[PDB]
Structure formats: C-alpha cells, structure tokens
Amino acid sequence: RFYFIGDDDLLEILGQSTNPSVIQSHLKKLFAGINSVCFDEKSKHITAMKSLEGEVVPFKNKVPLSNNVETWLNDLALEMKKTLEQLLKECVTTGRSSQGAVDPSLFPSQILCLAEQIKFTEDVENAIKDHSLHQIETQLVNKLEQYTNIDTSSEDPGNTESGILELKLKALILDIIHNIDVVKQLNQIQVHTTEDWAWKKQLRFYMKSDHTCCVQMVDSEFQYTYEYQGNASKLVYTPLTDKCYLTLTQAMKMGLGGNPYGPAGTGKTESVKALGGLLGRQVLVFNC
Amino acid sequence: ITYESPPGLKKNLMRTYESWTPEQISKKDNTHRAHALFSLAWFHAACQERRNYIPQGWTKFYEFSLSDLRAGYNIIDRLFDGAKDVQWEFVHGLLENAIYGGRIDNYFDLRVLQSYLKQFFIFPYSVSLPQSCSILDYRAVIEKIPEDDKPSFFGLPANIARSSQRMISSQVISQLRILGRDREIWSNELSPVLNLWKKLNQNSNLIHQKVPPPNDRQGSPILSFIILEQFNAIRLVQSVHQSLAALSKVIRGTTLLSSEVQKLASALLNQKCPLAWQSKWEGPEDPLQYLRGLVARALAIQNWVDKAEKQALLSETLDLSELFHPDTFLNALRQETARAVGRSVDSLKFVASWKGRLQEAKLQIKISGLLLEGCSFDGNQLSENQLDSPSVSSVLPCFMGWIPQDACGPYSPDECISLPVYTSAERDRVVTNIDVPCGGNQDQWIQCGAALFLKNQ
Amino acid sequence: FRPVAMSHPDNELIAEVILYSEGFKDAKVLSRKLVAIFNLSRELLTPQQHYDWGLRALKTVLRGSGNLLRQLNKSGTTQNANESHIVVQALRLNTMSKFTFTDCTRFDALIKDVFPGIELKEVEYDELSAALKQVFEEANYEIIPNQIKKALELYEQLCQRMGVVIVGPSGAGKSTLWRMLRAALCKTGKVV
Amino acid sequence: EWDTFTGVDQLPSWIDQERSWAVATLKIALPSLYQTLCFEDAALWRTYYNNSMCEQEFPSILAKKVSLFQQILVVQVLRPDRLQSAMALFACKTLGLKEVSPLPLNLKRLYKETLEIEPILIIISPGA
Ligand SMILES: Nc1ncnc2c1ncn2[C@@H]1O[C@H](COP(=O)(O)OP(=O)(O)OP(=O)(O)O)[C@@H](O)[C@H]1O
Numbered sequence A: 001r002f003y004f005i006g007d008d009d010l011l012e013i014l015g016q017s018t019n020p021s022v023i024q025s026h027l028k029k030l031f032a033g034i035n036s037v038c039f040d041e042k043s044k045h046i047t048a049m050k051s052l053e054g055e056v057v058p059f060k061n062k063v064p065l066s067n068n069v070e071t072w073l074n075d076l077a078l079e080m081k082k083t084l085e086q087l088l089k090e091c092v093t094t095g096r097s098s099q100g101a102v103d104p105s106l107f108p109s110q111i112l113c114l115a116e117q118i119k120f121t122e123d124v125e126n127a128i129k130d131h132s133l134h135q136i137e138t139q140l141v142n143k144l145e146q147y148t149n150i151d152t153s154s155e156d157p158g159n160t161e162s163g164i165l166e167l168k169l170k171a172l173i174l175d176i177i178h179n180i181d182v183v184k185q186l187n188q189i190q191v192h193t194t195e196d197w198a199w200k201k202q203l204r205f206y207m208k209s210d211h212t213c214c215v216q217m218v219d220s221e222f223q224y225t226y227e228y229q230g231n232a233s234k235l236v237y238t239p240l241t242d243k244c245y246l247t248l249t250q251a252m253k254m255g256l257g258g259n260p261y262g263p264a265g266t267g268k269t270e271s272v273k274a275l276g277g278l279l280g281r282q283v284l285v286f287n288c
Numbered sequence B: 001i002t003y004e005s006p007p008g009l010k011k012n013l014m015r016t017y018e019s020w021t022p023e024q025i026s027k028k029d030n031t032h033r034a035h036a037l038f039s040l041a042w043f044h045a046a047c048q049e050r051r052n053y054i055p056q057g058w059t060k061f062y063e064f065s066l067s068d069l070r071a072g073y074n075i076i077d078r079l080f081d082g083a084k085d086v087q088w089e090f091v092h093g094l095l096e097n098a099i100y101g102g103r104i105d106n107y108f109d110l111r112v113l114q115s116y117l118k119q120f121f122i123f124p125y126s127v128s129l130p131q132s133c134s135i136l137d138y139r140a141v142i143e144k145i146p147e148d149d150k151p152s153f154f155g156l157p158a159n160i161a162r163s164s165q166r167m168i169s170s171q172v173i174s175q176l177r178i179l180g181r182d183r184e185i186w187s188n189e190l191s192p193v194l195n196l197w198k199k200l201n202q203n204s205n206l207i208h209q210k211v212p213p214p215n216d217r218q219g220s221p222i223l224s225f226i227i228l229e230q231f232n233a234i235r236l237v238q239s240v241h242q243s244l245a246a247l248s249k250v251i252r253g254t255t256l257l258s259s260e261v262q263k264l265a266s267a268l269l270n271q272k273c274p275l276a277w278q279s280k281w282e283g284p285e286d287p288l289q290y291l292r293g294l295v296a297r298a299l300a301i302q303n304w305v306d307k308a309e310k311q312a313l314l315s316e317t318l319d320l321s322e323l324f325h326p327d328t329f330l331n332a333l334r335q336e337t338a339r340a341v342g343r344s345v346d347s348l349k350f351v352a353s354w355k356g357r358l359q360e361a362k363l364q365i366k367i368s369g370l371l372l373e374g375c376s377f378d379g380n381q382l383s384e385n386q387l388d389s390p391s392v393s394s395v396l397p398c399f400m401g402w403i404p405q406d407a408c409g410p411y412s413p414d415e416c417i418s419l420p421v422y423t424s425a426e427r428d429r430v431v432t433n434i435d436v437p438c439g440g441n442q443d444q445w446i447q448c449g450a451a452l453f454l455k456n457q
Numbered sequence C: 001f002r003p004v005a006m007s008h009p010d011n012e013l014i015a016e017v018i019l020y021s022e023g024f025k026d027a028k029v030l031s032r033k034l035v036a037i038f039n040l041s042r043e044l045l046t047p048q049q050h051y052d053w054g055l056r057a058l059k060t061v062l063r064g065s066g067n068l069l070r071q072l073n074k075s076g077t078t079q080n081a082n083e084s085h086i087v088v089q090a091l092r093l094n095t096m097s098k099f100t101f102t103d104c105t106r107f108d109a110l111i112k113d114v115f116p117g118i119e120l121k122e123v124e125y126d127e128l129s130a131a132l133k134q135v136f137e138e139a140n141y142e143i144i145p146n147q148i149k150k151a152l153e154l155y156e157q158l159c160q161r162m163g164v165v166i167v168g169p170s171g172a173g174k175s176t177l178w179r180m181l182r183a184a185l186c187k188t189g190k191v192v
Numbered sequence D: 001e002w003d004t005f006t007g008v009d010q011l012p013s014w015i016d017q018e019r020s021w022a023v024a025t026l027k028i029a030l031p032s033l034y035q036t037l038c039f040e041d042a043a044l045w046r047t048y049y050n051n052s053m054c055e056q057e058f059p060s061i062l063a064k065k066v067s068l069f070q071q072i073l074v075v076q077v078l079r080p081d082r083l084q085s086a087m088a089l090f091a092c093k094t095l096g097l098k099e100v101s102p103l104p105l106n107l108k109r110l111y112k113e114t115l116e117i118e119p120i121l122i123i124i125s126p127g128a
C-alpha cells in the first residue's frame, strides 16, 4: 500500500514504530476506512477502530505492536478481514432465526445492509419457486413502515451524547425501496421460475458454504473482499445504474476494463465507487 | 493493405462465414441452432451496412467491431449449450443493454436497434431460402443473394437511392477531375458573398439601421419574447454588416489588415462560417444561405411585431420557419395558457392534432408549413413511399395548444408514434416530438426512420 | 475497454426517494415540483453562459432541505405548511446567487406560478451584518446595502459548497467583498 | 468528350429544367450526337425514361450508332439516378471484370505471399 504514501510519512512510520501520535496522525491516510484507533492500557495493543462520525467496531483479538512495521500491518489487514467475516456470520446467524435481530448499535451498517440483502435474496428465490406471494410484498411494505415510524424516535432528540447511528437507518431505507420496486415489477410481469432472465437480471447476493459472500449477476460472479467502508453516501437506484452495472460486470467477465462516458455532470465517477462499495473492494480514485 | 468493412451485403456475409470455423457451427444439435447463428450474421451485416446512408439509417457513424460479433457468438454458445428453451427476449435484452446499445447516445437510434432486434427473432421471404445444418449451403445461399443491394431489404424508401447516387456520382466525377490537372482577396473569389448581401439589403435600411429599446418583462409573456427576438435580430444583422464592411474596405478601398479580418477571410475563402457568427445563431454551413435565412427572419420578426401588437396573434395562420428559438415561443404559450386557465404550469401537456379544432385547450393557433421525410403523410393514415416518390413532402396544417393533464387527448394513446421535429436536413437538434396517427404496425414506421423538419430555407 | 452510455439520469426518482428517506413525507408531490422548476427555468429563462441545472445543483438542494428539517424538529414542533414552505428557502439558498436583477424577478414570478402563496422570506441573521458594517466603518469605505447583501450571500455559498467563482468586470468591487468579509468574520469567527 | 463529361431550351418540352440546362450544355458543346440522337422522338425515349434498371433498356434501333461511352453521356443528361451502375457496367465491359468490387481480405491468404525483404504496412480506419 505504500505507493501512495509520500516518502515524508513513510520514513516516519518506519522510524516511529511505537509512537501513538504518529499512528493516529498517519494511519488514516493508509487505510481509508479507519479514521483512528484506540489503544490498550499499556499502549501495547490496538483493540478498536473508529469512523468519521464515530462508528466504533471492536476487533476480535488484540494486535501486538512491534518494531518491524510490516509485521503488525499484516496483522491489521488479516485481523480486520477476520473480524468483519466473523461479525457477518454472527449477524446472519441470528438474523435467519424467526425473531428479528434488530440491534443496530451492535453492528456496523456494512453488515446490516448485506445481511438484509442476502436474506431477501434467499427468501425471494424460495418465493418464485413456491408461489407469487404478495405476502412478501406486504411484509416489505409493513417493515418499511416500521422503520419510517421508528425514525421519528431519534429525529426529535437528534443531538444527544453517546447516541448517533440514525444513519444506519437511512442507509437501510434505500435498499428496502429497491426491494419494493423489484418485487413490484416481478408482480407486474408475473415471472414463472428462477431461470427466467427477468430475475437473473437483478443483482443477487448469495451465500457460499464457506460462509463468505459471492456477488453474482447473470453468470459472472466475484467475491466480497471485506474492505471496511464505514458510513458513506449511497445512491438512488435509477434504471441507468442497471445499464451501468450489467455492462461493467460483463466486461469484467470477459477480462476487460470499462469506459463509461457521456456529457458533463451525470454520475459516472461515483457509480464506479458505488459498485466498489456494493461489492466489498477498495477504490483508489486518481486523476490523470 | 486497407483493413475495412466489405463494400456489400453478400460480401459481408462471405467475410463473416469465412471467418467462422466449421467445427464451431457443426454441433450435434443442429436444426434450430445454426439458423439463429445465421440470424446473428444477418443482424451484424445489416447493422453494419446501414451506415452508408447518413443521417438516415443512423444519426452518426457508430463503431461496430468484430469483437462485438465474437462476444455475441459467446452469448449464443452459452444460451444454446445452456439447458433448455432459450428466451428470445433476453438475447436482445442483454444484446441491446451491453453490446450494440453501448455505442448509442440518441434515443431514436436505440429505438431503431430495438426494432431490428424484435424483428429478427421473418425475412424478405423470396430472397431467403434457408437450409439445414449443411455448412456449404449456408455458403451457397449467399451466392443466391443478388449482387446489387436494395433498401427494401432494409426499410428505406426509394428516393434515398436517387439522392445518394446523384451525390456519390458527383463526388467520383470531381475526384477524377482532380487526377487530370493575398491577390485572390484582391481578386474576386469572395465578391459574390458581398454581392448577395447587397441584393438582400438594398431596400431595408430601416431593417439594419433601427434601434429597439432594451426592455424588461411586460404583462403577457408573449410580448417580451418577440421584443427580445427583435432586439437579437437587429443586433446580429448589424454585427454582420460591420464584419462585412471591414472586409469590403480592405479590398475595394484604402486601408490595411487586422487579424480578425484574416479570420473572416480565411473562413469565407474556405466557404465555412466563422465561429463568431455561430456563437450567436446556428445557421447553414453555406454562408450565402446563412445570409439568406438571416435577412428573411429580419423581415419576418417585424411583421410578427406588427401583427402581435394588437393581440391578434391567435387568429392568423403563422409559420415556425421564422423563429430563431421556437421552443421558447412554445413555452411562452405554456405560460399564457397556465395563467389563463388558473392551474399550475407543471400540470399541463402539449398535444397537437389534425382532425379538427382543439376543444379542451385554451388557445388554438394554426401552424402549417412543416416538411416530412421517410413517409407520405395523409390525414388519419401514414402511407408508404414509392419508387418515384419525391423527397420533400408538404403537410396538412395543424392546431396547437396546451392541454391540462389527465384529460381526454384528441388521439387515443395506442394509435400514434412520436416523431422528432428537427430544424433542417442536417438533423442536429430536437424541438419537440408530436404524435401522428399510425393505426397499427408501427415497426415499419420505426425502420423507415421518419422525421419532420420545421422548414427549409 | 468496453464502453457504457451514461447520458441522461433521472430526476423524479432520485428526488422522491431522497426526500422520502430523509423523514419528509410528501415526496411524491414536491419532487415533481422540483424537477418541473428545473426544466422550466432551464427552458424559458434567458440562456446565460454561466448558469447550471445539473444533477449537482439538485443534490445540493436536497441536503439543503434535509438540514432545515433536521433543525426544525429537534428545535421545535412539526406541522403542515412549513414542510412545503422549507423547500423554497432551501432552493433560494443556491439559485438566487446566479441571477441578474430582472431574471431574478422573472424567476420569482415562476416560483409564484408553481407554488401559489408560499412566496417569500428573507435572510434570518443580522448580527454578522453589524460587524460587517463595523468593518466598513473602520476601513473608511462607504456603506452600500448591495455589498452587504453580496457578502452575506458569499458566506452562505462558502458554507454551502467547496469553491466559489466571483464573476465581474474590471474594478467593479469583486475583491473588496472577500477582503472585508475576512475581517468581519475574523472578529468573531475563529481564524481565516 | 471527357472534358464535357467532367464538366471542364424551348425545343424539349417533356423534361425538367434541371435536365434542360444540361441539355443546353450538350447541345452547345457536342452538336454531332445532338444530330444523331433525334431528341424529338417521344416514342422510344418515353419508354427509356420509364424503365427501372434502365442501364440495359437501350433503344436497339440506335444500338450500332452509339458507343459505350456515349450511352453514359445520354444517362448523365437524362437521369443521374443510374450513373453508379452505368460506370460499373462500363468498366466491367471494357475490362471483362465480373465485379468492380474486390475480393475480401483473408490474412491467412496473404501470409504466404510476403517475404522478409520488405515489411507489411496495414493501414487502419476507424473501427478497425
Ligand atoms: N464601499 C466602498 N465605497 C467606495 N469605494 C469602494 C467601496 N468598496 C470598494 N471600493 C473601491 O472599488 C475599487 C475596486 O475594488 P475591487 O478591487 O474589489 O474591484 P475588482 O473588480 O476586484 O478589481 P479588479 O478589476 O482589479 O479585480 C477600489 O479602488 C475601492 O476603492
């Protein structure tokens, strides 16, 4: 990752291999997700990470600091990926039970949105196999009504102390509206089975038996690479993004790049970062 | 080696089927499968060969590759050697949404691609004698296709070939004419420009020597439009007169040169128009025809003022040739109707008609003089063109007004087709899109590429 | 590569889903109102070089409405007409800056035509204008209300987005604006 | 012939003005074919003026008094909606070629012809 750090900070991180002020001042520019970290009671381990607004996720194990800098940066990378992986499994494991696992303090929004989309996918692919099931559309309408009603419980207090993450709700409403429109169009065309291409046109988030995600469009598939994004502004799913997503995923299936274009001021630049957000990669926007 | 497209239909099919290898086509499952491969081959060949007529079959020259064709072959491989009963829908769905529509920006070319994709999943039937999975019969039907090509295979009318061969013949004759073979400013390579100007403006000294007052918004929003129109017109006319007086004095008089004089002289010697003139108003690339159109609108807008001072602009038959910016005029009508009715401006619609006066509209104005191509217009019915069909067809007049939403339109929704209304034959910018009564079988009227031009000259 | 067409986005769908997500309830009416304002204002008003009605101006006005409804529930109560009254101010925090005199009046006449009686409300704050007139009084200029309006306008834009153009001819008072807003803000605000 | 070919009337009545100006050009330039043609026929030229694929519907009375190049002079003055096929069959008759188009461009064919003294310059076009 060091090709984007200047020399001026890189020799600091090589030299100051124990200084906490250096780590909190320059670990932000290395991993874009983590804004700051904590320290344990002797400054010998790192136990948590933060966000811009203060979204805090603990790590599943302490991280031993040392002098050789790669020999704990590698530990950060592995332990972040393992922490998000086990946290996703725990969330989906409680969520596929009958009762709701609604506890939005306990998980970051990155796992809430993903768990809701995976469970949505498996339920709808049970549905179209079994029955047209307007019950599921009515269930989504009532669930969305519930979230919009609970949204008025945090809006009136607003600025409190040690209470944020009304944003985890607002980053969930949009995916629910997406699912509303998908089920409504499946109702309008009356699709018979799963192999009908009006379902496989739509973006699918399956689960693999190794418990890791596998984002799969029409036939091309990828893997979720567990980059911790934190809170960020997502996009409204206009039907132009259908065009964009399908072209880029088929181009990646053929092993090529992708060149969106058009006049000035549309959304092509942020669409790529949005795809990288929905996929689990990290995006390094440049200028040429 | 020049590395390009084949110059004909069956040439393109021969190149295609030479590029295939026969073990690809010869699979066990045979009969319903290679005919789809021939459909892909004909579709690729057709979409490439539409490009010879511009802007008719496509609005620009879109780049279609052989990599696109091989990607499509990959698609049809994964379909037919995929399990059962390939939906013809999603072949053209994925095909438009990824491969061939990924070149397209205008909407009407997307419509044309939609029509070919819907059509080719049946042929000109007499020329099409398909066969079984025998590969050399697929080779031999190509020789059964004739040498010369016909736009009836494609959908264009027959006057297309007349205009095309006139222009291409003049091109090749001038090109073989090439193989046989500051003083010019002091000479007369540019004198007929000034000569046409002196014929346009010798008895209109008021029309290039009057000053309108700089005005703000009056009562009704149709007065302000025409006053700004008058002001912009007189401003552009006097700017042109200055830009020609300078280049007149450097030739037929006693003065010296600047750089902008050289810019005007260079552009007019190459007989293009300078960028300063196109900064104000887009005109024809002929500077002569540009001066023609300009002086015509200069007479016109004074007549528009004379008949619109008395609010008699509702009764008289008028023509949209004479508006520099006609959609702003139509949106001024939108404001006057939305103010006269007593309803918000967002809740109106724009529908014109031919079978009588508008009932539910607020105002009715007679607009005629439109020109049409790609078809032959009649009241209540569009008729196909013929061999001896003339190119430019005039039209029945129309009644235009603004209608409130969720009201009964004069035409039923599933009997009409939207047609763009361009500005001239170059097909550059879109004014509106009026509906015209089709009466079923709309796909022919798609693949004709029907248009409608506001005027000419 | 593999080229993708990204020419036209939508404007009703984004504007209704955003307002429905941001706690506001009546999105299905007001989003269409916004989009019609954009289309008419782009369509009939005189085509100056420097105007814009892209997706960025829309995305600005939506957050300009979300912030006002973020204040007016934790700082008070909620009712009917204020919910459609907010979007006029949250639109005029952007759109007022571009105009001339007469085009701003005709834009106001268009705002009356889309929204019948919800016309006007002015600048809320004045305690910075006291310091601004103080700093003009210090540096021996004159005091013109137009300069005051433009300086308060600049502070609004600088809070709103990242970069500001100040278009103007030669010598016609376009650098003294930021030059005095510097000291007038620095007398109370932190460090400029 | 070639110069008036490359561009370097109250007597006809059934024609257009657009062809009539070229009629005046042909009459002032080459009065010999003007005499041999007898333009006031209105019997055979009425038939020729109405055929589709009119490259081969020549009036066979004059089929031995008019050369191949003078038929194209007739075509250009009467109907310019035929000149491309007219030139095409003119060249195909004078050179015996069965098509004015070339063969395709299989590089597997042009592999074996070349040799390492000179290289192979592949000119491209847009989309190639
Ligand atoms: N309130 C005021 N009363 C009187 N004069 C003023 C006032 N404010 C500014 N001026 C005068 O206006 C003049 C130009 O100011 P300013 O530099 O902002 O114009 P400008 O357009 O930025 O200049 P430039 O054309 O160099 O960019 C200054 O000389 C100043 O004296």
Ligand SMILES: Nc1ncnc2c1ncn2[C@@H]1O[C@H](COP(=O)(O)OP(=O)(O)O)[C@@H](O)[C@H]1O
Residues within 6 Å of the ligand: A234, A235, A236, A237, A238, A263, A264, A265, A266, A267, A268, A269, A270, A271, C014, C055, C056, C059
């Ligand atoms: N689908 C969308 N939903 C919400 N906002 C969007 C969407 N598409 C674009 N935007 C907004 O438009 C702005 C510009 O997008 P960008 O990708 O930079 O377009 P461009 O590169 O053409 O300027 C961004 O601020 C982005 O937030």
Ligand SMILES: [Mg+2]
Residues within 6 Å of the ligand: C174, C175, C176
């Ligand atoms: Mg200055």
